[PDB]
Design a protein around this ligand. Structure first.
Ligand code: NI
Ligand code: NI
Ligand code: NI
Ligand code: NI
Ligand code: NI
Ligand code: NI
Lengths: 566, 100, 101, 566, 566, 100
């Protein structure tokens, strides 16, 4: 028959042309496409469509999907579209029209007796986030990150030890083996980084052969041209990524010397703005190069009224610095600069910075990577208006550019994009369901490997799952063997070949990294700008093509006090 | 006491409500979690007093007004639900559009 | 400002376009209510509903997906049907066809 | 010598002729028999009886029990007796007189060096409850159920997904395999139900071969005569049980049509009263048939002042119904009827309804199956007086009739009575110890497979286990490998033969179901009445043999506000 | 150059000659030695020493340590010295000078790329405590004990059952096997004790062959001369230890009869003072013998104002005694004696009592063994002044004497000193890091097998690990497989040979006990006094060489209200 | 409410502070854990009110004096740190030598 658009949205979620506000921000998305056939939408419930002979077919398990997310509004780097999502064998099967081919038209995702149903009408579905700057200080970080919508965590550490408090390094074969075993207990995909600070290649090769998927070069262990060159040489032969935290003290040289040591080889620069570490005061100029994949850590995102005040002390504790030792404090005002902090936000909006990460418990907030990324997008819309790439009266392009920062780009940078990072067929089904009013803040459902791993859950003894108190609790996908089957432990190609998994008796699924040396700035989705950027040695002013790059500090931010109890 | 898991869970709701209660006392406009906790706790005490489900479904809509909560908060709470032990056992109270 | 609000553009959606439809007068002869779903094979509904079952063969209710039409005891009403598509193979319901058509 | 009866009770618990009040209800049990030899009771403690050469013997482990529960007051479907209980190899060894045959008379349960002791004098001991209507919405339900005294949970689900919120179905081979693996992490015996709504037999056979012990037919997936017949045909060939939630809408026919589709084949009817689902308004008439094993879900037990008010909204949320859609709300007053709700209580008292269950978080309370069953018995005694079967001035018969509802009958209905369901030799030692003042509300000890799995526990750092705060905490029987050894995962005969346990690498003990097709109403212990029941289509009045069946709503109930903090 | 001593201490911790106060007690330790080379100390952090080519070398993993604890102040039975500690393969590698041999002098602990760093400057490092009197009433005791600084727990039990509430016994092959499996889930080294009360040797041999590392003789199961002799005979042939709780009632004889039954064979006497159990009123005289290894349980340590008042009721609950039964209460004033309670403190100060333990939840506090031991040392310094063995103006000797009580002596007594008990090369790396202000009360870090297992941890979402709330949370060393690799399950030589580990499929590392029959009072470090002690049968006065031994009850104690929230 | 793990963790801090608050009210000299909880909770409420980080770093040093706490307590707390949601998101407040 006919139905009004409003009633249609209330029933099946918005359709082509309808706009939706992201949480309490000023960002609006608009449905670009709808893959359904009007009047043939699948809906679950008493007397609804998904029933035997109707929206459910007679096919065997091999011929239908295991899980279907109905009427989902997908927000990914490739589009903002309405569609059903099919999940089979823990992987994304199809993005199309679900139903029963026996009586319905254009069915691409068959529903049968073996099909579970998740109702996503009115919800936004995204890929799980990927944080590539984790300090394994405590195991509790995994739950915190999972609840925020991050499903993959890459970093290093052995626990609350000085080395880990300061750097993302899991030092040596023994600790690497131990952390690989401990990883099976965590509900997120994991990959470890070893200590790359050494001028003897074999010491690095052992670590890669032991299982790390990358090497962290950190100034606390000596970020010298010799160490840097050594790590990159081994990286080039083993196809692993290098993450850099350069020489802030300019002890071995300036940024141009570090860049020279790198010599055009692929490298991921951590907290490229510098507050989290790096040549003072111009490490930010690194984003101008083609071999550099730049990321930001979150405490500086976005620039607000309390940012500076807060940073001065946070620096000390992380890096084991002494507030009484003049030299330990003199490089505070050299590391914390309003000028670069303000510029960073703009550089993200332009696509010069391609990734966002946490820097968990070491000048970073593990549960705020997604949240802060959206706060930057909001503040940039507010201050700079629409991007040159926008089309139509929506913020669709700005949304694709920013979502790519914590999803596909991190995946590409660390050689795991063949497994995760986006909602594309064949990829692991790490999905996150959001109610529009809580987008980026509190997820409705977090799916890992095809099983719900965590979700808000009300009174266990209640007659329904909705009564208070509702708080995040672990689900079946986070339990024992089901967990192992739904998570991945990433290994280096060498470790995989050496039989590390069998020797350590790892229980989870194994994935191998590849393509870490071949990625470059141009490969970063919607974030490939290589600006002609300069930093004034005296004033610290950031300039691109001579024009001053800056922004104003926010007094109030969305996705803040309206959602949190504390 | 022999506290079961459900009784301990409700202690979390009670404590969350003590937080909101104090903030409201200072005269702040409550946020989302504070509002839910405040109204929910009110209902549990109602059941403890022996009030009926029907009474609470009504009384629960008069705890907080639109001017005591932050903007957008009333729309983020189309309803509130909580169970408690009434004289006749556990029952569910559903308050529709609690904030007006 | 309303967190997550929609800005639905005004208008209407035409459902099940380009498909054969037919109207049928139906009467509930049973003593208990009967509610029929959008995708249920009408020709195989509860036997207490009197109507031309022959005409409703391979048809379902032409109503938005997931909704229903209720028939109180003794109730008579004209409903509009729309033909099944896909393979046009009916399996299940009361098991009267269990195959194509 | 001689001892007064009162002092004797204070020391060894009540004996023949003594009566005990069940919690704060009006139900009184009377000790029917005592298997001890007066003056030869075994008691543990300093200077007590169970000591080397005295109440403890010189036999090897193979010749004595592992655990003895001394001076227990057993309450089971077969009797209310005083006796010692012997447990060996995780199973019930004997119910008799424990001690040392060397110096004591009539010892049937030998105590040796290898024997642990649990003092049960003054306590009531029962079999663990069995809930056959679980929606696996969250893993936390298992702890909640265990604390209440339920040791076996049968149901289906994959977590907080729409399909599971509404129905007890673990859809397909992949989800079944995943849930079977996750089950090893839970401290309760578990058996899964698959989605039985399909008209193609092979789609069902795959699920049974994958591991489910039953098939759930649910109207939300289409409870048509075709689907019903299909599920029963496969059930008949694979020896698994079918659980039904019929067509409330009368879409495919009325109750008599569903009954016709069933065709005299064995089937378990869920929430037979109808509020939880089923042909409106007469699904309750199903309890009149010999092939129907009827059960109630708990929110309607017993009929109280707030029952109706509460149900109207609970319905909506569970089944994904729209309060704005007239058709979605019109069938509320058709599903919630004071008339049938009131009759249900009486039908239980008469033995027409044979089981009680939860319907966990989908119109049911997981931790209240036992509690509510006793509340119904109390209210029925209060309103109807003694049952025709009672003998003596006690409620012994009414107690055996009601305890059977959540113990042996559920076990018989699902083909697991050879393993659990009652305190009989050879059965798994799933026992629950209760202090009389807290019977049915808060257990003193919950034993799984011969090991305590959960119990109230005080200050961990205290000098004794009794100081506050005392709350339920997991014990050794709920830990890792000890847990696997003390729980059972029930498989279908086909799954067991196919080597499903070895393939999924399941760690727990495996049990297989059998005898699901042969059980009938007559086999339900103390609950085999097949009444000539009718329901008026207009008034909804329930009549048995023409007489009106009804009851009055309770304003206050026992086992309520006197025991709970919230 | 030159640096003042004060500034030096603030940077690298105290050095030779500097004194440090233990928590808020009156005990002062003085650094006896410093193994560093002034100006060559290793320090970690930005711009610090441990960096490539500097304090970190170019060696492979096999040639450097996995973990280094820098600038630690070691407090062990052998000395109070300043040094770096090297840990390799989960064991203590060396106590010396860490660094890079390439540019630094006297390096004995090489730091390379494979080396993690824990900064211990300003902290006191000790071996993990060992509690040999655990009642396994609940699994939660392990976390409580670990947080206090105890890394090994020896005892028996099956959970909250009467037998375990009263005695440290894991009765028989089945329960022993079950507890051995459950032990893999706990983050502490564990060894079980079986029930030794039997007069048939084979019943004991089975238990030893099943896996216990000792046998508990307890009066509640009959501590008769026959049972005692039987247990010791088997102990002598299987090289396991016997723990005794003698006949308080003097039912089979007096203390001299029990001593006679023992016949000069090695035995560990539990709570030798008697309040926790033993011949009334003179079980304390046992500490005079060479074959007796005496220990105290903690509620009587030290003698304070509320000790007596508290004990009268605690006794009842533990041993299942009846306050109405005169005989059950008459032996209260016979068991609780101010005279022996006061003497115990002095006997510890003199070295007559060699061990301290808890007696967890059965007249003892699991998290207070270390805490109370130091409170006794404090009270003894206050009342008796310096020990005859002290040298210099410090309490160094008294500190070595008391630390040995909960570390090396328990290890020697139970045949596990080859694995744990002290900071010596080749021993398992179970270490505890303490800030001087919280010594003995709240640890800064607890290391098990070379991995941090538990530590105080602040806000998980914070930018650093220090923000509130800070409370103890499990770390990677307490997770799944990493845990198995970092803990030990002690087996008897027979069990190890019988393949018990493989049969039960135990996952943790296995250690075997040996040397239990050969240890004697003279082997107890700094606690080998065999005094000529007597107890007056009437007055209960304790006398050594005729002189009265006594002390005064404390009204206030350190390590109490200044540190605890409740 | 949809409480995340970090919000539930802070409920522990709040409750710990309710304990100290009552003891101080009775006139007791607070101990170590009580002092930390009391001052920490104060700061969280400051952020809720909208006070700046800079203001709180100062105000936090005037909650408890040396005469309201037990001996040695001021020296056991060289600083106090806590994060809370300010109008501009999560921020860290560090109070140096809070007790003087
Ligand atoms: Ni960094
Ligand atoms: Ni970092
Ligand atoms: Ni149902
Ligand atoms: Ni159900
Ligand atoms: Ni004892
Ligand atoms: Ni003991």
């Amino acid at each position: 028959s006919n139905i009004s658009r409003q009633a249609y949205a209330d029933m099946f979620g918005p359709t082509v042309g309808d706009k939706v506000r992201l949480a309490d921000t000023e960002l609006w998305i608009e449905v670009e496409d709808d893959l359904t056939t009007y009047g043939e939408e699948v809906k679950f419930g008493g007397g609804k469509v998904i029933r035997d002979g109707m929206g459910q077919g007679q096919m065997l398990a091999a011929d239908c999907v295991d899980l279907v997310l109905t009427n989902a509004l997908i927000v990914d780097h490739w589009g903002i579209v309405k569609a059903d999502i099919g999940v089979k064998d823990g992987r994304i099967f199809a993005i199309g029209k679900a139903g029963n081919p026996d009586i319905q038209p254009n069915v691409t995702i068959p529903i049968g007796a073996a099909t579970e149903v998740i109702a996503a009408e009115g919800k936004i579905v995204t890929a799980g986030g990927i944080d590539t700057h984790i300090h394994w200080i405590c195991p509790q970080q995994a739950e915190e990150a999972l609840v925020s919508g991050v499903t993959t965590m890459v970093g290093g550490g052995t626990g609350p030890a000085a080395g880990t408090h300061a750097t993302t390094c899991t030092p040596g074969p023994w600790y690497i083996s131990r952390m690989l075993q401990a990883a099976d207990s965590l509900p997120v995909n994991i990959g470890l980084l070893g200590k790359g600070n050494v001028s003897q290649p074999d010491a690095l090769r052992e670590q890669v052969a032991a299982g790390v998927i990358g090497l962290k070069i950190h100034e606390d262990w000596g970020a010298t041209p010799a160490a840097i060159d050594c790590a990159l040489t081994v990286a080039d032969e083993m196809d692993i990524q290098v993450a850099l935290h350069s020489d802030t003290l300019n002890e071995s040289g300036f940024v141009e010397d570090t860049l020279a040591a790198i010599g055009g080889r692929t490298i991921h620069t951590f907290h490229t703005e510098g507050a989290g570490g790096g040549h003072a005061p111009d490490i930010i100029t690194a984003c101008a190069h083609p071999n550099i994949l730049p990321s930001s850590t979150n405490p500086t995102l976005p620039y607000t009224l309390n940012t500076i005040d807060e940073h001065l002390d946070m620096l000390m504790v992380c890096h084991h610095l002494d507030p009484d030792i003049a030299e330990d404090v003199a490089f505070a005002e050299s590391r914390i600069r309003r000028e670069t902090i303000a510029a960073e936000d703009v550089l993200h909006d332009l696509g010069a910075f391609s990734l966002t990460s946490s820097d968990s418990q070491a000048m970073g907030r593990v549960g705020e990577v997604i949240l802060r990324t959206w706060q930057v997008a909001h503040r940039m819309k507010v201050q700079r208006g629409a991007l040159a790439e926008e089309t139509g009266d929506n913020d669709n392009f700005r949304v694709k550019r920013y979502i790519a920062k914590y999803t596909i780009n991190p995946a590409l940078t660390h050689g795991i994009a063949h497994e995760v990072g986006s909602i594309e067929v064949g990829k692991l089904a790490d999905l996150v369901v959001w109610s529009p009013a809580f987008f980026g803040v509190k997820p409705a459902t977090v799916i890992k490997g095809g099983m719900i791993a965590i979700a808000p859950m009300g009174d266990i003894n209640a007659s329904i799952p909705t009564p208070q108190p509702v708080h995040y609790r672990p689900m079946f996908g986070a339990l024992g063997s089901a967990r192992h089957h739904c998570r991945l432990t990433f290994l280096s190609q060498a470790a995989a070949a050496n039989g590390v998994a069998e020797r350590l008796n790892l229980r989870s699924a194994i994935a191998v990294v590849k393509g870490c040396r071949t990625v470059q700035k141009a490969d970063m989705v919607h974030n490939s700008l290589q600006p002609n950027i300069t930093v004034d040695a005296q004033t610290y002013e950031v300039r691109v093509d001579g024009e001053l790059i800056t922004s104003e500090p926010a007094d109030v931010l969305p996705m803040a006090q309206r959602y949190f109890l504390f | 006491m022999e506290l079961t898991p459900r009784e301990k869970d409700k202690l979390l709701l009670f404590t969350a409500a003590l937080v909101a209660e104090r903030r409201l006392a200072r005269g702040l406009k409550l946020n989302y979690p504070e509002s839910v906790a405040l109204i929910s706790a009110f209902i549990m005490e109602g059941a403890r007093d022996g009030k009926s489900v029907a009474s609470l479904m009504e009384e629960g809509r008069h705890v907080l007004t639109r001017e005591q909560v932050m903007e957008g908060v009333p729309e983020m709470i189309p309803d509130i639900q909580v169970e408690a032990t009434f004289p006749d056992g556990s029952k569910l109270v559903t308050v529709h559009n609690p904030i007006i | 400002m309303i967190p997550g609000e929609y800005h639905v553009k005004p208008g209407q959606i035409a459902l099940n376009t380009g498909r054969a439809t037919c109207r049928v007068v139906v009467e509930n002869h049973g003593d208990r209510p009967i509610q029929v779903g959008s995708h249920y094979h009408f020709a195989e509904v509860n036997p207490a509903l009197k109507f031309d079952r022959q005409q409703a063969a391979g048809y379902r209710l032409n109503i938005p997906a997931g909704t229903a039409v209720r028939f109180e005891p003794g109730q008579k009403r004209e409903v509009e049907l729309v033909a099944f598509a896909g393979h046009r193979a009916v399996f299940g319901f009361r098991g009267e066809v269990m195959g194509p058509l």
